[PDB]
């Protein structure tokens, strides 16, 4: 038992990180088959940062302008192409450590495990959720651009995120693996603030389901409520609306616990109104929206 914030084993991704250097700018690339993927702002100098012309900055580049390095071995670049905000660099050698993979685009509220690297060498791994304003709250320093966020199902690694920049607020932004940014962002060094952040409502119910499995019971409410009445109170405290799909996805946990999802909503209504009264849930004095229904089931059911 117990409940912990938990990431995916980064073994299959550890064999896909490489170093990429155009000029003296350095970051990370994703080596899959004979292709390396990385952000496009690697072709920028320390100066072209306000409004950089990535198109005009890439025409001047040739294949021998990209130093791709996999450990102590450099990969000869034979072709490069830009696609949205990422650069794809073809190499003469296919990665012998490539696993089964898909390029997915996640929705707000879904989780993925980030393997943060610097200079193509993995540094650590943590779990993050895509905030409603399409940012993440990770932990990135300079040289982190190129790190990937992924989910592993079975033996397949669904790549879903690649890191790019950090906002003035301190939250982290980036693209998917086809370069399309997550949110209204651009790869320029301008004053940018995301959208207004809401609480991922379904995950909080999912996180309260993990708490009842684990012994916590004091926040439970005998009497039910409705999907119409809860969504009325949900937005009162800046919570995403609760769709009938959300209820359906919580089906496994509504079964393991014997508490209807709408019964769990009434308990969330009481918790929102009164607070915790200095009591703790799963070791947290704040309602956590960072665990999807899948993270809860995978950690609770055998």
């Amino acid at each position: 038992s117990g409940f912990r914030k938990m990431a995916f084993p980064s073994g299959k991704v550890e064999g896909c990180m490489v170093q990429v250097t155009c000029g003296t700018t350095t970051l990370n690339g994703l080596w899959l088959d004979d292709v390396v993927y990385c952000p496009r702002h690697v072709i920028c100098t320390s100066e072209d940062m306000l409004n950089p012309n990535y198109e005009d900055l890439l025409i001047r580049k040739s294949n021998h302008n990209f130093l791709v390095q996999a450990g102590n071995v450099q990969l000869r670049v034979i072709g490069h192409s830009m696609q949205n905000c990422v650069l794809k660099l073809k190499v003469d050698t296919a990665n012998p450590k490539t696993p089964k993979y898909k390029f997915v685009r996640i929705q707000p509220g879904q989780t993925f495990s980030v393997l943060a690297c610097y200079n193509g060498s993995p540094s650590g791994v943590y779990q993050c959720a895509m905030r409603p304003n399409f940012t993440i709250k990770g932990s990135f320093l300079n040289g982190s651009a190129g790190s990937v966020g992924f989910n592993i199902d079975y033996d397949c690694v669904s790549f879903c995120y690649m890191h790019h920049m950090e906002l003035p607020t301190g939250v982290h932004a980036g693209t998917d693996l086809e370069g399309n940014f997550y949110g209204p962002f651009v790869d320029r060094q301008t004053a940018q603030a995301a959208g207004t952040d809401t609480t991922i409502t379904v995950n909080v119910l999912a996180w309260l389901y993990a708490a009842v499995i684990n012994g916590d019971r004091w926040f439970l409410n005998r009497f039910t409520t409705t999907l119409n009445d809860f969504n009325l109170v949900a937005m009162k405290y800046n919570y995403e609306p609760l769709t009938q799909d959300h209820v359906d996805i919580l089906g496994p946990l509504s079964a393991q616990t014997g508490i209807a999802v709408l019964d769990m909503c009434a308990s969330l209504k009481e918790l929102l109104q009164n607070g915790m009264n200095g009591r703790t849930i799963l070791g947290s004095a704040l309602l956590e929206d960072e665990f999807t229904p899948f993270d809860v089931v995978r950690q609770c059911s055998g």
């Binding site: 003296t24 700018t25 350095t26 970051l27 952000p39 702002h41 690697v42 920028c44 100098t45 320390s46 940062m49 610097y118 200079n119 990135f140 320093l141 300079n142 040289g143 982190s144 651009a145 190129g146 890191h163 790019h164 920049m165 950090e166 906002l167 003035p168 932004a173 962002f185 790869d187 320029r188 060094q189 301008t190 004053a191 940018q192």
Partner: peptide
């Protein structure tokens, strides 16, 4: 006050 691209420049 502005966004910081997090490659390693210098």
């Amino acid at each position: 006050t502005s966004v910081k691209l997090q490659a390693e420049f210098r």
